[PDB]
Amino acid sequence: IANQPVVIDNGSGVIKAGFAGDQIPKYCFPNYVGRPKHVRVMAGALEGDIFIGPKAEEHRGLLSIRYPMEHGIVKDWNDMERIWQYVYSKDQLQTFSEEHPVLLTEAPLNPRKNRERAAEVFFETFNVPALFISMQAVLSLYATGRTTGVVLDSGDGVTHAVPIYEGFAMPHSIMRIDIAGR
Amino acid sequence: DPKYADLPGIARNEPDVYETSDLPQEELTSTSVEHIIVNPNAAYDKFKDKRV
Ligand SMILES: Nc1ncnc2c1ncn2[C@@H]1O[C@H](COP(=O)(O)OP(=O)(O)O)[C@@H](O)[C@H]1O
Numbered sequence: 334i335a336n337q338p339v340v341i342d343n344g345s346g347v348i349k350a351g352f353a354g355d356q357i358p359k360y361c362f363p364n365y366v367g368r369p370k371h372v373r374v375m376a377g378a379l380e381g382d383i384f385i386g387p388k389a390e391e392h393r394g395l396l397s398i399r400y401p402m403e404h405g406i407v408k409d410w411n412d413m414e415r416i417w418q419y420v421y422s423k424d425q426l427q428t429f430s431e432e433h434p435v436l437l438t439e440a441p442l443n444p445r446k447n448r449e450r451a452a453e454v455f456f457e458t459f460n461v462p463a464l465f466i467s468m469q470a471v472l473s474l475y476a477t478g479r480t481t482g483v484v485l486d487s488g489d490g491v492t493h494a495v496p497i498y499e500g501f502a503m504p505h506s507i508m509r510i511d512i513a514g515r
Numbered sequence: 516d517p518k519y520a521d522l523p524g525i526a527r528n529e530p531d532v533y534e535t536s537d538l539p540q541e542e543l544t545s546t547s548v549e550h551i552i553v554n555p556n557a558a559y560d561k562f563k564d565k566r567v
Pocket residue numbers: 343344345346347348486487488489491514515
Protein backbone atom coordinates (compact mmCIF):
# COMPACT_ATOMS: atom_id res chain seq x y z
CA ILE A 334 0.00 0.00 0.00
CA ALA A 335 1.21 3.51 -0.92
CA ASN A 336 1.98 4.63 2.63
CA GLN A 337 5.10 4.79 4.72
CA PRO A 338 5.88 1.24 5.91
CA VAL A 339 5.86 0.62 9.65
CA VAL A 340 9.04 -0.83 11.14
CA ILE A 341 8.61 -2.73 14.41
CA ASP A 342 11.83 -3.11 16.39
CA ASN A 343 10.79 -6.04 18.57
CA GLY A 344 13.13 -5.31 21.46
CA SER A 345 12.87 -7.77 24.33
CA GLY A 346 13.61 -5.34 27.09
CA VAL A 347 13.06 -2.16 25.13
CA ILE A 348 10.70 -2.62 22.21
CA LYS A 349 10.66 0.10 19.53
CA ALA A 350 8.73 1.07 16.42
CA GLY A 351 8.94 3.42 13.47
CA PHE A 352 8.94 3.91 9.70
CA ALA A 353 10.98 3.87 6.51
CA GLY A 354 13.76 6.31 5.66
CA ASP A 355 14.29 7.27 9.29
CA GLN A 356 17.34 6.13 11.27
CA ILE A 357 15.94 6.21 14.79
CA PRO A 358 12.60 4.49 15.52
CA LYS A 359 9.85 7.09 15.42
CA TYR A 360 8.33 5.96 18.70
CA CYS A 361 10.28 4.34 21.52
CA PHE A 362 9.04 2.93 24.85
CA PRO A 363 10.05 -0.47 26.25
CA ASN A 364 8.23 -3.76 26.32
CA TYR A 365 6.12 -4.04 29.48
CA VAL A 366 2.54 -4.11 30.71
CA GLY A 367 1.84 -1.63 33.48
CA ARG A 368 -1.30 -2.71 35.30
CA PRO A 369 -2.67 -0.52 38.13
CA LYS A 370 -2.23 -0.88 41.89
CA HIS A 371 -5.11 1.02 43.56
CA VAL A 372 -8.80 1.91 43.21
CA ARG A 373 -10.07 5.23 41.83
CA VAL A 374 -11.79 7.46 44.38
CA MET A 375 -11.46 11.14 43.47
CA ALA A 376 -12.91 12.44 40.22
CA GLY A 377 -9.67 13.02 38.35
CA ALA A 378 -8.42 9.49 38.78
CA LEU A 379 -7.86 8.14 35.27
CA GLU A 380 -9.46 5.00 33.89
CA GLY A 381 -8.32 2.01 31.84
CA ASP A 382 -5.45 2.09 34.31
CA ILE A 383 -3.23 -0.32 32.38
CA PHE A 384 -1.07 2.59 31.31
CA ILE A 385 2.19 2.67 29.37
CA GLY A 386 4.82 5.36 28.82
CA PRO A 387 4.62 8.72 30.57
CA LYS A 388 2.14 7.51 33.16
CA ALA A 389 4.18 4.35 33.65
CA GLU A 390 7.54 6.05 34.17
CA GLU A 391 5.72 8.82 35.98
CA HIS A 392 3.71 6.68 38.35
CA ARG A 393 6.04 3.75 38.73
CA GLY A 394 4.99 3.21 42.33
CA LEU A 395 1.31 3.17 41.36
CA LEU A 396 1.42 0.74 38.46
CA SER A 397 2.00 -3.00 38.83
CA ILE A 398 4.17 -3.28 35.76
CA ARG A 399 4.58 -6.73 34.26
CA TYR A 400 6.42 -8.00 31.20
CA PRO A 401 4.80 -10.03 28.41
CA MET A 402 7.89 -10.79 26.29
CA GLU A 403 9.14 -13.54 28.58
CA HIS A 404 12.13 -15.40 27.10
CA GLY A 405 11.71 -13.14 24.10
CA ILE A 406 8.17 -14.49 23.77
CA VAL A 407 5.09 -12.41 24.46
CA LYS A 408 2.64 -13.91 26.94
CA ASP A 409 0.22 -10.98 27.25
CA TRP A 410 -0.77 -11.25 23.62
CA ASN A 411 -4.01 -9.29 23.85
CA ASP A 412 -2.30 -6.73 26.02
CA MET A 413 0.51 -6.38 23.49
CA GLU A 414 -2.14 -5.79 20.85
CA ARG A 415 -3.49 -3.01 22.99
CA ILE A 416 0.06 -1.70 23.36
CA TRP A 417 0.12 -1.58 19.60
CA GLN A 418 -3.17 0.27 19.76
CA TYR A 419 -1.33 2.59 22.15
CA VAL A 420 1.09 2.93 19.28
CA TYR A 421 -1.89 3.20 16.87
CA SER A 422 -3.19 5.98 19.11
CA LYS A 423 -2.65 9.72 18.79
CA ASP A 424 0.61 9.29 20.67
CA GLN A 425 2.55 7.32 18.08
CA LEU A 426 0.84 6.22 14.88
CA GLN A 427 -2.36 8.32 14.62
CA THR A 428 -3.30 5.94 11.77
CA PHE A 429 -4.71 2.49 11.09
CA SER A 430 -3.36 -0.96 10.41
CA GLU A 431 -5.02 -0.98 7.00
CA GLU A 432 -3.22 2.23 6.03
CA HIS A 433 0.43 1.84 6.49
CA PRO A 434 2.50 -1.14 5.43
CA VAL A 435 3.95 -2.90 8.43
CA LEU A 436 7.17 -4.86 8.95
CA LEU A 437 7.58 -7.24 11.87
CA THR A 438 11.01 -8.45 12.97
CA GLU A 439 12.10 -11.66 14.68
CA ALA A 440 14.78 -13.42 16.62
CA PRO A 441 16.15 -16.79 15.54
CA LEU A 442 14.72 -20.09 16.83
CA ASN A 443 11.25 -18.82 17.29
CA PRO A 444 8.25 -21.11 17.66
CA ARG A 445 5.80 -21.00 14.80
CA LYS A 446 2.85 -20.54 17.18
CA ASN A 447 3.97 -17.04 18.12
CA ARG A 448 4.31 -16.05 14.47
CA GLU A 449 0.91 -17.56 13.69
CA ARG A 450 -0.81 -15.81 16.61
CA ALA A 451 0.86 -12.56 15.57
CA ALA A 452 -0.43 -13.00 12.02
CA GLU A 453 -3.91 -13.57 13.47
CA VAL A 454 -3.64 -10.18 15.13
CA PHE A 455 -2.10 -8.52 12.06
CA PHE A 456 -4.79 -9.64 9.66
CA GLU A 457 -7.86 -10.13 11.85
CA THR A 458 -7.79 -7.55 14.61
CA PHE A 459 -5.35 -5.31 12.87
CA ASN A 460 -5.87 -5.49 9.12
CA VAL A 461 -2.56 -4.50 7.51
CA PRO A 462 -2.57 -5.13 3.74
CA ALA A 463 1.22 -5.03 3.35
CA LEU A 464 3.04 -6.98 6.04
CA PHE A 465 5.58 -9.72 6.60
CA ILE A 466 7.46 -10.93 9.66
CA SER A 467 11.19 -10.54 9.05
CA MET A 468 14.26 -11.24 11.18
CA GLN A 469 16.43 -8.94 13.31
CA ALA A 470 20.06 -10.01 12.81
CA VAL A 471 20.03 -9.39 9.05
CA LEU A 472 18.59 -5.96 9.82
CA SER A 473 21.62 -5.20 11.94
CA LEU A 474 23.65 -6.34 8.93
CA TYR A 475 21.75 -3.82 6.80
CA ALA A 476 22.78 -1.24 9.38
CA THR A 477 26.43 -2.28 9.26
CA GLY A 478 26.34 -2.99 5.54
CA ARG A 479 28.32 -6.17 6.21
CA THR A 480 27.66 -9.52 4.57
CA THR A 481 29.35 -12.41 6.41
CA GLY A 482 28.73 -11.32 9.98
CA VAL A 483 27.90 -12.78 13.37
CA VAL A 484 25.12 -10.83 15.07
CA LEU A 485 24.90 -10.89 18.86
CA ASP A 486 21.78 -9.35 20.33
CA SER A 487 21.70 -8.08 23.88
CA GLY A 488 18.28 -7.65 25.37
CA ASP A 489 16.58 -8.68 28.55
CA GLY A 490 15.35 -12.22 27.89
CA VAL A 491 17.09 -13.16 24.64
CA THR A 492 20.70 -13.73 23.53
CA HIS A 493 21.55 -15.13 20.11
CA ALA A 494 24.67 -15.43 17.99
CA VAL A 495 23.61 -15.38 14.34
CA PRO A 496 26.37 -16.30 11.88
CA ILE A 497 25.06 -14.69 8.71
CA TYR A 498 26.30 -14.97 5.14
CA GLU A 499 25.45 -11.97 2.89
CA GLY A 500 22.31 -11.39 4.91
CA PHE A 501 21.31 -15.06 4.59
CA ALA A 502 22.38 -16.94 7.67
CA MET A 503 22.74 -20.66 7.91
CA PRO A 504 19.50 -21.33 9.83
CA HIS A 505 21.38 -24.14 11.57
CA SER A 506 24.67 -22.56 12.63
CA ILE A 507 22.70 -20.00 14.64
CA MET A 508 22.51 -20.37 18.41
CA ARG A 509 19.94 -18.69 20.65
CA ILE A 510 19.51 -18.36 24.42
CA ASP A 511 16.53 -16.66 26.02
CA ILE A 512 18.12 -14.87 28.97
CA ALA A 513 19.85 -11.52 29.55
CA GLY A 514 19.75 -8.61 32.05
CA ARG A 515 16.27 -9.40 33.44
CA ASP B 516 -43.84 57.30 91.09
CA PRO B 517 -47.61 57.31 91.94
CA LYS B 518 -47.02 54.39 94.26
CA TYR B 519 -44.07 56.35 95.65
CA ALA B 520 -46.62 58.99 96.64
CA ASP B 521 -49.15 56.39 97.92
CA LEU B 522 -47.44 54.72 100.85
CA PRO B 523 -45.81 56.73 103.65
CA GLY B 524 -42.90 54.35 104.24
CA ILE B 525 -41.10 55.53 101.09
CA ALA B 526 -37.90 57.58 101.05
CA ARG B 527 -37.28 60.30 98.51
CA ASN B 528 -34.42 61.83 96.45
CA GLU B 529 -33.32 58.38 95.29
CA PRO B 530 -31.34 57.98 92.07
CA ASP B 531 -32.28 54.25 92.20
CA VAL B 532 -29.47 53.31 89.83
CA TYR B 533 -25.87 54.09 90.72
CA GLU B 534 -23.29 52.93 88.24
CA THR B 535 -19.55 53.42 88.09
CA SER B 536 -17.57 55.22 85.41
CA ASP B 537 -17.58 54.04 81.82
CA LEU B 538 -15.25 54.59 78.89
CA PRO B 539 -14.96 53.17 75.37
CA GLN B 540 -4.16 34.85 61.61
CA GLU B 541 -0.68 36.28 61.90
CA GLU B 542 0.78 33.07 60.50
CA LEU B 543 -1.05 33.09 57.21
CA THR B 544 1.78 35.47 56.30
CA SER B 545 4.43 33.08 57.69
CA THR B 546 7.26 32.88 55.18
CA SER B 547 7.84 29.14 55.10
CA VAL B 548 4.25 28.21 54.30
CA GLU B 549 2.91 27.98 50.79
CA HIS B 550 -0.45 29.29 51.91
CA ILE B 551 -3.03 28.94 49.16
CA ILE B 552 -6.51 30.38 48.65
CA VAL B 553 -9.01 28.60 46.43
CA ASN B 554 -11.92 30.53 44.80
CA PRO B 555 -13.98 27.31 44.94
CA ASN B 556 -16.38 28.47 42.25
CA ALA B 557 -13.73 28.35 39.50
CA ALA B 558 -12.04 25.09 40.52
CA TYR B 559 -15.47 23.62 41.24
CA ASP B 560 -16.76 24.38 37.77
CA LYS B 561 -13.42 23.18 36.44
CA PHE B 562 -13.33 19.78 38.13
CA LYS B 563 -17.14 19.68 37.90
CA ASP B 564 -16.79 18.42 34.35
CA LYS B 565 -14.96 15.30 35.61
CA ARG B 566 -17.86 12.90 35.14
CA VAL B 567 -16.39 10.11 37.24
N1 LIG C 1 23.29 1.12 28.62
C1 LIG C 1 22.99 -0.17 28.86
N2 LIG C 1 23.83 -0.94 29.57
C2 LIG C 1 23.55 -2.22 29.82
N3 LIG C 1 22.43 -2.84 29.41
C3 LIG C 1 21.51 -2.19 28.68
C4 LIG C 1 21.75 -0.78 28.34
N4 LIG C 1 20.69 -0.37 27.63
C5 LIG C 1 19.85 -1.43 27.50
N5 LIG C 1 20.34 -2.51 28.12
C6 LIG C 1 19.68 -3.82 28.18
O1 LIG C 1 19.09 -4.11 26.92
C7 LIG C 1 17.71 -4.42 27.10
C8 LIG C 1 16.90 -3.87 25.96
O2 LIG C 1 16.28 -4.99 25.34
P1 LIG C 1 16.41 -5.07 23.76
O3 LIG C 1 17.88 -5.10 23.47
O4 LIG C 1 15.54 -4.01 23.17
O5 LIG C 1 15.84 -6.51 23.37
P2 LIG C 1 16.29 -7.08 21.94
O6 LIG C 1 17.63 -7.72 22.18
O7 LIG C 1 15.15 -8.02 21.63
O8 LIG C 1 16.35 -5.84 21.08
C9 LIG C 1 17.29 -3.86 28.44
O9 LIG C 1 16.44 -4.79 29.11
C10 LIG C 1 18.57 -3.69 29.21
O10 LIG C 1 18.72 -4.70 30.22
